[PDB]
Structures are given as C-alpha cells and as structure tokens.
Amino acid sequence: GFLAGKKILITGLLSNKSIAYGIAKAMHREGAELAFTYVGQFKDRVEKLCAEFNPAAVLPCDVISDQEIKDLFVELGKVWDGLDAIVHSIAFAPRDQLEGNFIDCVTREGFSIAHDISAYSFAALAKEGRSMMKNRNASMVALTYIGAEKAMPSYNTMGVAKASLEATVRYTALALGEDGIKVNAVSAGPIKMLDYNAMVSPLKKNVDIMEVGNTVAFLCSDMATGITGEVVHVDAGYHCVSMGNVL
Amino acid sequence: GFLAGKKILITGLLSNKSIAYGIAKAMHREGAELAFTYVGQFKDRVEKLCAEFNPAAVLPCDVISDQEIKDLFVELGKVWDGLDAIVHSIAFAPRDQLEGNFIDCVTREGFSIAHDISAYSFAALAKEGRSMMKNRNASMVALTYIGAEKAMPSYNTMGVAKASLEATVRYTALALGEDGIKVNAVSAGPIKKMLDYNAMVSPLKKNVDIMEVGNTVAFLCSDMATGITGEVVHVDAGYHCVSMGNVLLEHHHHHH
Amino acid sequence: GFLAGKKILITGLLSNKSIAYGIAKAMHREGAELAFTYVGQFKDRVEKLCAEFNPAAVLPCDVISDQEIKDLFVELGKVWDGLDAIVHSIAFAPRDQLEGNFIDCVTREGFSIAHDISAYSFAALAKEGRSMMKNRNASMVALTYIGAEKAMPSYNTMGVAKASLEATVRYTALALGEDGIKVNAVSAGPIKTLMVSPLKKNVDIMEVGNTVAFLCSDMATGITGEVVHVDAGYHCVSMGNVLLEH
Amino acid sequence: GFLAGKKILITGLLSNKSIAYGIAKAMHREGAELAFTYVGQFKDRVEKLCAEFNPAAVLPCDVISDQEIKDLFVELGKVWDGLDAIVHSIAFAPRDQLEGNFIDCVTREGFSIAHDISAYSFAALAKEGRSMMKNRNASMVALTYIGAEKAMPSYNTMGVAKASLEATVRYTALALGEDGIKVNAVSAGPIDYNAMVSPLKKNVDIMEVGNTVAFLCSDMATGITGEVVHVDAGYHCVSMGNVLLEHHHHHH
C-alpha cells in the first residue's frame, strides 16, 4: 500500500457511515497504522467500530478541552515513535444555530462554540502533534464543505465556521511547512438536499465515503508532497458548476 | 450628494488616520446624515474627532457586550426614524496571536476573542439593526484584508477571523436579502509593516489612501449599489490580481 | 456629477435595452462627454440611438479589424486631446457553439472567433487607446458574466471566452497600471428571464450602468484588476431549488 | 499498481525533463498501458524517450490539424478496446507574446494561436477521443499554471490562454460527466524564489506532479471532477513576497 508503515491518527469516527470510516478503510487498505479518538461516552461505540483496523490505540479526545488534547499525545507517545498524519473530521454547531434565517439564528455563543469545535481544534491539534511530526513528509487533512465558499440556506453558522477552518488550513500550511508537514483539506459533497447535487453536478450522483476516504489517504502519502494549503473537492463536480433551477 | 438624506451609522472611528474617518469624510460630502460609536473611555476623543461631521449621535458600543449592542439601537432609535447603512470597521486580535509562527502563537482564547470581535459583531449589528433597516434599499458594509484569502507571516489568527468575517458577510447577504438589505465588504490594502511591497508589486504602483477606501464604502451604501451584495471589492491598488514573489529594491548608501 | 468633463468611449450600443445604453444614461447623468462606436451598415440606427447623449463622435469600429480600431482612435484623437475611459461591452459567439453539449458543439473556428471578438478585442482597444489615456486616472471596464467562473448548460464556448476576457482584464490591469489606467470588469446578471439570488430579483441596466460609471470615476482609483458582480448576489450563493411538477 | 490495465494516452513528452515524462514514470509504475503522441519529424526522438515504458502505440498528433486528431483516434482505436485517460501537457505561444509589457506584445494572431494550441486542443482531444472513453470511469487531465488566476510579468498571452484552458476544463467536465468521465487539471509549480515563498520552501519535482496526475486517473479519484489541483509546494495559498535589497556603498 502507498501508506505502508506510516502512523496516522484518525479523529471523528462515530459510525458505520462516518466519512472518517471511509478514511479508515482506505488507509488500512494502504497498510497504514491507525489510532482513533472518541468524545464523551462513546468509548464503547468506537472501539467496537474500529476493531477491524487493528488499532494501535483508541483514546479519548474532546477538542473542547486543552488538557484532553495534551494527554491525547502524551498517551499516543507511549505507543508511537512519532506520528505521520492527523486526519481531522470534526464539526459541530448547536441546533439553535442551524435551522432558519441565519441572522435570526446566530448567537454569540453558537458562533464561538461552532468556530471552536470546527475550526480552532484543527490548529490546536497541529500544535500538540507537531513535535512528533517533524521532517518525515508528515501530512494533515481536514474535512470541509462548500458552505464555506458559498452562502446556502440553513447551513448558517456552520458555513461561517467552515470558512474559518479553510483559513486555518492555509495558515497551518505555512506554519508547518518548514517542518515538511503538508496541510490540506477535502471538501466533500453530501453523503436531504443531496438530490439537488445528484441532478446538477456533472457526474450525476452523490459521492460515497470511499471516494472521499481515498482522497484523504492519497493526501497523506509521498505522492502528494508537492501539495499543501489546498482544498480538493470530492463532490461529483458540484463545485465548478452554476445552474440554478432543475426539474 | 448620492447619499443625501441617508442615515448611516459608522463604527471604528479612532483617529484622523482611521479608515472610518475616510469613510465618514466621503459619506458626509455626499450628504449622508451620520452617527458614531466609541468603545471605553473615548466619548471625548471621538466627540471632538467627529464634530466636523455634525453627528446625529455619538454612542457607546463595545461589541463584546450584547447589552451595549441592544442599547445602541434603542438609543439610535430615539433620534432616527429608521436606519440606512451600517459601516463595520472593527478588528481585534490579542497581540500574543500576532507575533511569529501561527501554530506557536495561536490559542483557543485568542482565536475566540479574534472571531468574536472581528466577525461575530458584524452579524450582531445585523441582528439588532435589522428592524431599523427594513424596506429602504438599506446597506451594510464591512472592512477586510487579503489575509482572509491567503496566508501571510504574522497576520495569523487575524487572517482567520477575517475569513470568518467574509463568510459572515455572505450569509448575511442571503439572510437579509429578503428584507431589501444589500451586504458587502471592502478589502483594503495597507495604509501608511510592508506598504513598500504592496506599492511595488501592485499594478497601479502605490498604496491606497483612506479616501479611496472611503469613497467605495460610500458607493456601496448608495442607491446606485443596490445590485451588489455578498461581494468583496478590493481597494488595494490592484494587489489581489497579481502573482509575483520578491521584487528587488536597490538601496544606495553614502559613507563619509 | 462625478464624471464631470470626462471623455468616455462606449462600445456595444445596439439597442434601447443594451447594457451600454444603461451605462450611457448613467455616465451622461454624471456629467461625462461621450463617444460611440457602430458596426457596418448601422451608422444611422446608432446615430438616432445616442442622440439623447449629445455625442462627441459616432465612429465605425469592427473589433475584427485592426485597421478599423487604429482608425477609431486616429479619428477620436481629432475630436479629443485625451481619453478618459473605454467601455468594452462586446460579445459574440457563433450560434452553433451556444446550443447543446459543449464537446458536441465546440469547433476550432467557433473557439477562435468567440475569443477574438469577446476577449482579445479588449486588449486591442487598450493597445490602440493607450496613448490617449496616459496619466489622468483613466479607466477601462469590460462586461462579463459568471459563465466564465463556472460551467453552465448552453453558455458553452462563450463561457470560455468570458474566462479568457477576465484574464485579459487582469493582464491589462497589470500592463497599464503604470500609466494610472485602472482596468476592471463588471459581471452582470441577466436582465430578464422567460428566485435564486438573495435579492430575489433581476438587476436592471441602471444598476449595471451606475457601477460601470463609478468604475470610471475618480472615486475608484484604488481599484483595478477587479471583478464586481452586479447580479443581485447570485455569485455568493449556492442554492438551487429543485422544481417538482406533481 | 493503482492504474493496472488502464489504457492512457500521453501528450507533450519532448524530453526527459517534461512533465509528461514524470507522468509516464508514475503511470507505468502504477501498471498502466501507455500510448504517446508526437508532432512533425520527432517520431524518432519520442520513440527513444518512451521505449522504456513499452508504448502500446507511438503516433503522430499535431493539435493544430483537425484531421491529424481524427487519425489519432482511428489508429489508436485499432490498437485498443477503449480508452481510459488523456493527459494534456501541451502549451504554445509565439515568442513575441512573452517578452515584455503585455499590451505592447499581444497580437491578434498571437492571441488566437496561443488559445488554439494551449486551450482549444483540449476540447479538441476530448471531442475525437470521447467515443473510446464512454462509461469506464475514464478520466482527462490538463496541465495548467497559476498565471491563469493571477497576472505575472511577461507570461502575458500565455496566462490568458491558460485561463481559457482552465474554463475549458470546467466545461468539458460538465459536457462529459454523463459518460462517467472525470476532467481535471494540475496547476504545476515551476520545477528561483518559488523556493523561498512557498510554505514548503522548495520547487516541486516532476514525480510530485506525475504522481498527482496518475492519482487523477485512478479509480480513487472518481468523485473529483472539474477541479484544479495545485502541485506547487503550496505557493498558491500564500501572499508572501518581500522586498529584497541590494546594497550600494559609496565612500567619501
């Protein structure tokens, strides 16, 4: 596999259908070495889930907590020499933020909660895994979405938070370059308005967890060492089109 | 004046040199009626600074506080039937955010404050101004910078908070669209620290000035601009549209 | 008005409903002196058409012919001692390019012609016009459409041409900045159809006009190489409705 | 090899420093069968360069000639069941278009010559080779350069063309996706101070580009279409120039 022997930390694995899952699957296939984080009272749920990947570790990480992000690596450091990739599939906004007119919805707290879990956490990860990622063609990937680039209905505060992430990828790309660490993002399409997508986008379909999963994998390999600060769209083409109405 | 009779509220006015000043100077020339805000103990400084614009009111609004933002409009509403524009010229990041490698500097608290002040506050003003701005080809404008788009040494988390601002600007464009409110932003180049680089690479071979920025905020608050929303206009001497690397200045020295 | 005494060349006035007529109406109101180009056997229709703007000149110009473009300015230089702006509102693609699957329709010639009239002719105008535009905060503005930025059904070859056109804008901006000539483009949303954008309407020829006017004004001397969408926010939004029929 | 048994066609291999050489190495390592184009008398040259990849075919193609392009696909059609990918690494501008102030240089003939070879030819290839690619998760990749997005000195007409190419990539993507064809582009960095400004502080090398282009013709890349992927040490995502001084010292 094009990821043989590399050590990768995969965040965001919650279910059978998680993008993070497609990622794990692609990576395991390419023979990487894998570790997983869970939030809250899902210790159970995820270790069951990721058993098939022969995990090096399954460790708590609520990116709300600074001490938890520290410990995550202190404990990872008991299992690994260093670290090759960090994959970042983390996002969240309160409900109240996510359903209605955006300026009706938006509240100070929601804005900073959403930004904190969805954008900063990526940098916070880069900070604490850096020391074990130096000079090894190390890679970092985030999961993002076109609501960053373009305003949409009800994506709301989440779209803003995503734009925030994208900016953060670019600054991390520059901060971590000297250390030879690439930083990039995959922009997925939806996995109930995936209908629109399937009708408009040139490839006439929604994408699946394997297509994204493989892109994220490719982006943590030695083939992708010329790329950094980049948003790759894995969205059947949706991004490069501008129809309006369909019937 | 193309802004005649319009009631426009200006934020971020701190000095002679402030972008808001350029804005105001422009807006005043075009017959706008203007209000002003201040943060902290600047009632006097700012009252004396904006006397020349014959303000309708000068009002406390630290954008940190939900109460100050609500009380802003309750007050503004005592003097002004309704409201036409809001100019958002507000940026903050803790200095600890701005000195060196971005990953070295960035903190949860820094990131938080940065976005709170630099981006959220825009939506907050939209939230509390909205009712005063219903049905009058009303306008909001925000101020931004290319660091939103592309990474740079030092600008760091301010670069992110600006990207968050621009995203905020667009969502607001969609959200107040229904209420006839256009929402746009001006990306301004540096104003007299690397001005030099800007002035050497940029097509028009200069730095911009506050008039040049002011004049464009003016326009985007005019009935002439009512087809433009969610937009980022660069008033930056052309810097955005160009891709060079290092130029090569030639410093002469004389030693006696 | 903010265009008082400025001398502006407007291309592509063909109709009572042309964008260039909105531009004209706007610029004239803002106190500019104006000159207009016509094509072939249309001298008279364009003469009747711009009478209301008290034109300084009505001169032939088929942007196909270098000779015609050189001749425009030679003749324009006889009436004016310098030029303040050029308005580039010219677009053409052969009909067979514009209707169907792009890879089905596209031809070498169509590709050639569309780019020639739609994109290059901007550079040609800059090139011949330049010497009368030096050091007076002069301006060039092209009309463009989001079909350049993103692929659309039927717009096809035109979309690529408009793309070529917005690069022509950028390079010109860089090439002519050193003379104070600001070079910019307005991406115009369509005027009519026969819902999507945040303003929930179609922009009209005045809104487009007033922006082109402002982009030839002294107020916009710090703006160049830029695209300004006057399209009611369409560019910044990504909702397509599906339309069910029951 | 992630490209095993895919039939791919490679244009614009003119020497062993060509991007198309990087692509070829990448693709052959990934187990693809490859065919190559050449213009004019360069049959011999190109047959030598690529001999090492056991070309499935080596065939003439001047992208200026409609008829050469037709024959390209007629003949390739005799050798192959169908076709999996086309790699477009072809650019040309007249010399007079590239050495000065854009507006002084640019000409009607130049502008259109530049667009025909550098931009049209892509659609042109798509057109005539479409039929062999129908429904087999087939792919097209173009090579572009960041001067499509921004202006550089003297890249002039080429930057316009490359911009035009990039739109064509977008339209081809929509024209052809109904047949399952991905249509993308790699904006390569130059292979200096792109080595001083880029976050990764280096010039990307043909393998780094080749490997990417290969990936864009792998079955792993089936949800990516109409994209432009920068393989440029991160130069695109940055605004990082600074004024470099030379010191002149005069005594007394």
Ligand SMILES: NC(=O)c1ccc[n+]([C@@H]2O[C@H](COP(=O)([O-])OP(=O)(O)OC[C@H]3O[C@@H](n4cnc5c(N)ncnc54)[C@H](O)[C@@H]3O)[C@@H](O)[C@H]2O)c1
């Ligand atoms: N689901 C889709 O169809 C779709 C489409 C486009 C983009 N995305 C992207 O999907 C990514 C998320 O993955 P998903 O689609 O599998 O479901 P999701 O967006 O509902 O899951 C979010 C993940 O964040 C984790 N998480 C939330 N808060 C956390 C915290 N405080 N600390 C640690 N972890 C936390 C959760 O466990 C969950 O696995 C998001 O980053 C989003 O950008 C998803």
